[model samples]
Target: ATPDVDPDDRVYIVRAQRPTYVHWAIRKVAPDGSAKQISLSRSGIQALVALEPPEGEPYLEILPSHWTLAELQLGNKWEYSATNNCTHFVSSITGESLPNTGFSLALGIGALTAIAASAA
Candidate 1:
Protein backbone atom coordinates (compact mmCIF):
# COMPACT_ATOMS: atom_id res chain seq x y z
CA ALA A 1 0.00 0.00 0.00
CA THR A 2 1.11 3.54 -0.77
CA PRO A 3 1.62 6.12 1.93
CA ASP A 4 -0.35 9.34 1.99
CA VAL A 5 1.39 12.11 0.10
CA ASP A 6 0.72 15.82 0.01
CA PRO A 7 1.39 18.50 -2.56
CA ASP A 8 4.18 19.91 -0.41
CA ASP A 9 5.78 16.63 0.50
CA ARG A 10 9.49 16.23 -0.01
CA VAL A 11 10.83 13.54 -2.31
CA TYR A 12 14.19 11.94 -2.93
CA ILE A 13 16.26 11.20 -6.03
CA VAL A 14 17.22 7.61 -6.65
CA ARG A 15 19.47 6.04 -9.26
CA ALA A 16 20.04 2.49 -10.44
CA GLN A 17 21.87 0.78 -13.27
CA ARG A 18 19.81 -0.94 -15.91
CA PRO A 19 20.80 -3.49 -18.53
CA THR A 20 22.00 -0.76 -20.87
CA TYR A 21 22.15 2.47 -18.83
CA VAL A 22 21.68 4.18 -15.48
CA HIS A 23 18.20 5.31 -14.51
CA TRP A 24 17.03 7.90 -12.02
CA ALA A 25 13.68 8.77 -10.52
CA ILE A 26 11.83 10.83 -7.93
CA ARG A 27 10.45 8.82 -5.03
CA LYS A 28 8.92 9.13 -1.61
CA VAL A 29 10.69 7.16 1.09
CA ALA A 30 8.68 5.84 4.00
CA PRO A 31 9.83 5.42 7.57
CA ASP A 32 9.99 1.67 7.19
CA GLY A 33 12.73 2.03 4.58
CA SER A 34 10.41 1.50 1.67
CA ALA A 35 10.14 3.73 -1.37
CA LYS A 36 7.41 4.54 -3.86
CA GLN A 37 7.23 6.62 -6.99
CA ILE A 38 5.87 10.14 -6.71
CA SER A 39 4.19 12.30 -9.31
CA LEU A 40 4.78 16.02 -9.52
CA SER A 41 2.68 18.69 -11.12
CA ARG A 42 4.24 21.42 -13.27
CA SER A 43 4.58 23.84 -10.37
CA GLY A 44 5.92 21.11 -8.16
CA ILE A 45 8.49 20.31 -10.84
CA GLN A 46 9.56 23.93 -11.13
CA ALA A 47 10.06 24.32 -7.38
CA LEU A 48 12.19 21.20 -7.19
CA VAL A 49 14.08 22.23 -10.30
CA ALA A 50 15.08 25.52 -8.67
CA LEU A 51 16.30 23.79 -5.54
CA GLU A 52 19.94 22.74 -5.18
CA PRO A 53 20.32 20.70 -8.36
CA PRO A 54 23.25 18.31 -8.59
CA GLU A 55 26.42 19.52 -10.33
CA GLY A 56 25.81 17.35 -13.39
CA GLU A 57 23.15 15.02 -14.78
CA PRO A 58 19.86 16.75 -14.15
CA TYR A 59 17.18 14.28 -13.04
CA LEU A 60 14.04 13.45 -14.95
CA GLU A 61 10.86 12.04 -13.50
CA ILE A 62 9.96 8.63 -14.86
CA LEU A 63 6.97 6.44 -15.46
CA PRO A 64 6.09 4.83 -12.13
CA SER A 65 5.14 1.39 -13.32
CA HIS A 66 8.51 -0.05 -14.24
CA TRP A 67 10.81 -0.12 -11.21
CA THR A 68 11.77 -3.60 -10.09
CA LEU A 69 11.84 -4.69 -6.46
CA ALA A 70 15.61 -4.33 -6.51
CA GLU A 71 15.34 -0.76 -7.71
CA LEU A 72 12.90 0.02 -4.93
CA GLN A 73 15.31 -1.48 -2.45
CA LEU A 74 18.07 0.70 -3.89
CA GLY A 75 15.80 3.68 -3.45
CA ASN A 76 15.31 2.68 0.17
CA LYS A 77 18.98 3.14 0.92
CA TRP A 78 19.68 6.07 -1.37
CA GLU A 79 21.30 9.04 0.29
CA TYR A 80 22.19 12.38 -1.34
CA SER A 81 23.72 15.56 -0.05
CA ALA A 82 23.46 18.59 -2.27
CA THR A 83 25.76 20.60 -0.01
CA ASN A 84 28.71 18.31 -0.71
CA ASN A 85 27.35 17.37 -4.09
CA CYS A 86 27.85 13.78 -3.11
CA THR A 87 25.57 10.79 -3.38
CA HIS A 88 25.62 7.57 -1.37
CA PHE A 89 23.79 4.74 -2.97
CA VAL A 90 23.21 1.00 -2.86
CA SER A 91 23.87 -1.17 -5.86
CA SER A 92 20.74 -2.62 -7.38
CA ILE A 93 22.71 -5.55 -8.75
CA THR A 94 24.25 -6.59 -5.45
CA GLY A 95 22.02 -4.78 -2.91
CA GLU A 96 25.03 -3.43 -1.06
CA SER A 97 26.21 0.11 -0.36
CA LEU A 98 28.77 1.52 -2.77
CA PRO A 99 31.96 3.24 -1.77
CA ASN A 100 31.98 7.04 -1.60
CA THR A 101 35.22 7.20 -3.55
CA GLY A 102 33.34 7.76 -6.79
CA PHE A 103 31.77 10.95 -5.47
CA SER A 104 35.17 12.21 -4.38
CA LEU A 105 36.56 11.50 -7.81
CA ALA A 106 33.64 13.29 -9.41
CA LEU A 107 34.21 16.34 -7.25
CA GLY A 108 37.91 16.35 -8.06
CA ILE A 109 37.17 16.27 -11.78
CA GLY A 110 34.64 19.05 -11.38
CA ALA A 111 37.15 21.20 -9.54
CA LEU A 112 39.72 20.71 -12.30
CA THR A 113 37.14 21.45 -14.96
CA ALA A 114 36.11 24.62 -13.19
CA ILE A 115 39.70 25.81 -13.10
CA ALA A 116 40.21 24.98 -16.76
CA ALA A 117 37.04 26.72 -17.76
CA SER A 118 38.03 29.83 -15.87
CA ALA A 119 41.44 29.84 -17.51
CA ALA A 120 39.83 29.56 -20.94
Candidate 2:
Protein backbone atom coordinates (compact mmCIF):
# COMPACT_ATOMS: atom_id res chain seq x y z
CA ALA A 1 0.00 0.00 0.00
CA THR A 2 1.11 3.58 -0.62
CA PRO A 3 2.17 5.48 2.46
CA ASP A 4 0.51 8.72 3.59
CA VAL A 5 2.50 11.45 1.92
CA ASP A 6 2.08 15.22 2.15
CA PRO A 7 3.64 15.99 -1.24
CA ASP A 8 6.03 18.44 0.41
CA ASP A 9 6.40 17.29 3.95
CA ARG A 10 10.14 17.10 3.49
CA VAL A 11 12.04 13.83 3.11
CA TYR A 12 10.13 10.64 3.38
CA ILE A 13 11.38 7.04 3.27
CA VAL A 14 9.89 4.23 1.26
CA ARG A 15 11.75 1.04 0.43
CA ALA A 16 12.02 -0.72 -2.94
CA GLN A 17 12.80 -4.35 -3.71
CA ARG A 18 16.34 -5.08 -4.75
CA PRO A 19 18.23 -7.99 -6.29
CA THR A 20 21.16 -7.62 -3.94
CA TYR A 21 21.27 -9.53 -0.68
CA VAL A 22 20.38 -6.65 1.65
CA HIS A 23 20.18 -3.92 -1.00
CA TRP A 24 16.92 -2.01 -1.33
CA ALA A 25 15.41 1.15 -2.75
CA ILE A 26 13.96 4.12 -0.90
CA ARG A 27 10.82 5.26 -2.74
CA LYS A 28 11.82 8.54 -1.16
CA VAL A 29 8.43 8.32 -0.46
CA ALA A 30 9.44 10.63 -3.36
CA PRO A 31 8.62 9.25 -6.78
CA ASP A 32 11.45 10.85 -8.68
CA GLY A 33 9.15 11.95 -11.51
CA SER A 34 6.92 8.94 -12.03
CA ALA A 35 4.20 10.51 -9.85
CA LYS A 36 3.73 7.06 -8.42
CA GLN A 37 5.60 4.65 -6.15
CA ILE A 38 7.87 2.17 -7.93
CA SER A 39 10.43 -0.49 -7.10
CA LEU A 40 14.12 0.39 -7.18
CA SER A 41 15.01 -2.13 -9.85
CA ARG A 42 13.39 -0.05 -12.59
CA SER A 43 16.22 1.78 -14.28
CA GLY A 44 15.72 5.24 -15.75
CA ILE A 45 12.82 5.87 -13.38
CA GLN A 46 13.28 9.63 -13.32
CA ALA A 47 14.03 8.66 -9.79
CA LEU A 48 16.03 10.42 -7.04
CA VAL A 49 13.49 13.04 -6.11
CA ALA A 50 15.07 16.05 -4.51
CA LEU A 51 16.61 19.52 -5.03
CA GLU A 52 13.45 21.54 -5.65
CA PRO A 53 9.89 20.42 -5.17
CA PRO A 54 6.36 21.30 -6.24
CA GLU A 55 6.16 23.40 -3.15
CA GLY A 56 8.87 25.18 -5.10
CA GLU A 57 10.18 26.17 -1.70
CA PRO A 58 12.14 23.07 -0.68
CA TYR A 59 10.41 22.10 2.58
CA LEU A 60 6.96 23.52 2.41
CA GLU A 61 4.25 20.89 2.17
CA ILE A 62 1.74 22.92 0.22
CA LEU A 63 1.28 21.21 -3.15
CA PRO A 64 0.31 17.67 -4.07
CA SER A 65 3.49 16.74 -5.99
CA HIS A 66 5.79 18.96 -3.99
CA TRP A 67 7.91 19.45 -7.08
CA THR A 68 8.12 22.09 -9.73
CA LEU A 69 7.11 21.28 -13.31
CA ALA A 70 10.76 21.18 -14.28
CA GLU A 71 11.70 19.01 -11.32
CA LEU A 72 8.88 16.65 -12.18
CA GLN A 73 9.91 16.33 -15.79
CA LEU A 74 13.58 15.92 -15.03
CA GLY A 75 13.58 12.41 -13.67
CA ASN A 76 16.59 10.28 -12.68
CA LYS A 77 18.32 7.16 -13.89
CA TRP A 78 19.55 4.92 -11.03
CA GLU A 79 22.21 2.43 -11.98
CA TYR A 80 23.41 -0.04 -9.41
CA SER A 81 26.90 0.65 -8.12
CA ALA A 82 29.61 -1.51 -6.64
CA THR A 83 31.79 1.37 -5.53
CA ASN A 84 31.29 2.71 -9.03
CA ASN A 85 28.11 1.39 -10.57
CA CYS A 86 25.38 3.59 -9.05
CA THR A 87 27.91 6.10 -7.84
CA HIS A 88 29.34 6.18 -11.32
CA PHE A 89 25.89 6.69 -12.74
CA VAL A 90 25.24 9.56 -10.37
CA SER A 91 28.65 10.99 -11.12
CA SER A 92 27.97 10.68 -14.82
CA ILE A 93 24.95 12.86 -14.18
CA THR A 94 26.26 15.13 -11.45
CA GLY A 95 30.00 15.20 -12.21
CA GLU A 96 30.82 14.44 -8.59
CA SER A 97 30.08 12.54 -5.41
CA LEU A 98 28.88 13.28 -1.89
CA PRO A 99 31.06 13.13 1.20
CA ASN A 100 28.79 10.97 3.33
CA THR A 101 26.95 8.58 1.00
CA GLY A 102 29.84 8.68 -1.49
CA PHE A 103 27.27 8.73 -4.30
CA SER A 104 24.40 11.14 -4.32
CA LEU A 105 21.10 9.34 -4.10
CA ALA A 106 19.44 12.54 -5.09
CA LEU A 107 20.54 12.19 -8.69
CA GLY A 108 17.83 14.59 -9.90
CA ILE A 109 19.18 17.29 -7.64
CA GLY A 110 22.60 16.94 -9.25
CA ALA A 111 21.22 17.46 -12.73
CA LEU A 112 19.56 20.67 -11.61
CA THR A 113 22.30 21.97 -9.35
CA ALA A 114 25.25 23.86 -10.80
CA ILE A 115 26.88 22.53 -7.67
CA ALA A 116 28.24 19.85 -9.96
CA ALA A 117 27.83 21.54 -13.34
CA SER A 118 27.88 17.96 -14.58
CA ALA A 119 25.63 16.04 -16.96
CA ALA A 120 24.12 12.65 -16.82
lDDT of each: 0.31, 0.31
Tens digits of per-residue lDDT, candidate 1, 1-120, equal 433353333344455433322333345444555545421111311211111222223233333332333233432322233322222222332233434332333333222111111244
Measured over all alpha carbons after superposition, the RMSD of each candidate to the real structure, in angstroms, is 13.9, 13.0
Q: Which segments of candidate 2 are over 4 A away from where they belong?
A: 1-11, 15-20, 27-39, 43-74, 84-120
Clashes of each: 0, 12
Model 2 lowest lDDT segment of ten: 53-62
Let me know the TM-score candidate 2 reaches against the reference structure.
Answer: 0.24
Candidate 2 whole-model C-alpha lDDT, 0 to 1 = 0.31
Error of 1 at 18 (Å): 1.8
Candidate 1 ranges beyond 4 A from true positions: 1-10, 38-120
- Per-residue lDDT of candidate 2, residues 43-73 (tens digit): 2333342332121112112233322321342
